[PDB]
């Protein structure tokens, strides 16, 4: 079907806010990865399509999602990037796993409502 921009925003923005509310777990994901600042210059060799919470928020606010699954795909791109780049023992990897648990919990009832 057809989704209006504000219908998508009202439904999906709370699920994004649920990720931001995870502290410390959302902190590595709030801004685009800056490999030079972080000392990890191999990042863009490994992660070809970067994604983060700030970019998803902007796309939601600017109507760049036409369907809910496009938003879900970006959130999952952010997760899969972090599980790919970071080691299983690292903070970022474990924080990613926590965010994915929280997102799964919140997005399910929202998809039902849409
Ligand atoms: C998402 C992702 O793939 N990244 C690539 C790797 C990475 C990223 C962060 N960042 C991003 C800036 C904010 C941040 C905050 C924390 C934090 C805050 N509070 N606590 C308890 C932890 C941890 C990591 C990060 N560091 N590194 C590595 C460099 C050395 O450390 C690990 C992002």
UniProtKB/Swiss-Prot annotation:
The gene is CREBBP. Changing residue 101 to R: Abolishes interaction with ASF1A. It comes from the Eukaryota. This is CREB-binding protein. The chain holds residues 1083 to 1196 of 2442 of the full protein. Changing residue 93 to C: In RSTS1; mild form; impairs binding to ASF1A and acetylated histone H3. Changing residue 80 to E/R: Abolishes interaction with ASF1A. Acetylates histones, giving a specific tag for transcriptional activation. Mediates acetylation of histone H3 at 'Lys-18' and 'Lys-27' (H3K18ac and H3K27ac, respectively). Also acetylates non-histone proteins, like DDX21, FBL, IRF2, MAFG, NCOA3, POLR1E/PAF53 and FOXO1. Binds specifically to phosphorylated CREB and enhances its transcriptional activity toward cAMP-responsive genes. Acts as a coactivator of ALX1. Acts as a circadian transcriptional coactivator which enhances the activity of the circadian transcriptional activators: NPAS2-BMAL1 and CLOCK-BMAL1 heterodimers. Residues 80-98 are annotated as: Interaction with ASF1A. Residues 3-110 form the Bromo domain. It is linked to Chromosomal aberrations involving CREBBP may be a cause of acute myeloid leukemias. Translocation t(8;16)(p11;p13) with KAT6A; translocation t(11;16)(q23;p13.3) with KMT2A/MLL1; translocation t(10;16)(q22;p13) with KAT6B. KAT6A-CREBBP may induce leukemia by inhibiting RUNX1-mediated transcription. Rubinstein-Taybi syndrome 1: A disorder characterized by craniofacial abnormalities, postnatal growth deficiency, broad thumbs, broad big toes, intellectual disability and a propensity for development of malignancies. It is found in: Cytoplasm; Nucleus. Changing residue 83 to A: Abolishes interaction with ASF1A. Transmembrane segments: none annotated. Found in a complex containing NCOA2; NCOA3; IKKA; IKKB and IKBKG. Probably part of a complex with HIF1A and EP300. Interacts with GATA1; the interaction results in acetylation and enhancement of transcriptional activity of GATA1. Interacts with MAF and ZCCHC12. Interacts with DAXX; the interaction is dependent on CBP sumoylation and results in suppression of the transcriptional activity via recruitment of HDAC2 to DAXX. Interacts with phosphorylated CREB1. Interacts with CITED4 (C-terminal region). Interacts (via the TAZ-type 1 domain) with HIF1A. Residues 42-88 are annotated as: Interaction with histone. Methylation of the KIX domain by CARM1 blocks association with CREB. This results in the blockade of CREB signaling, and in activation of apoptotic response.
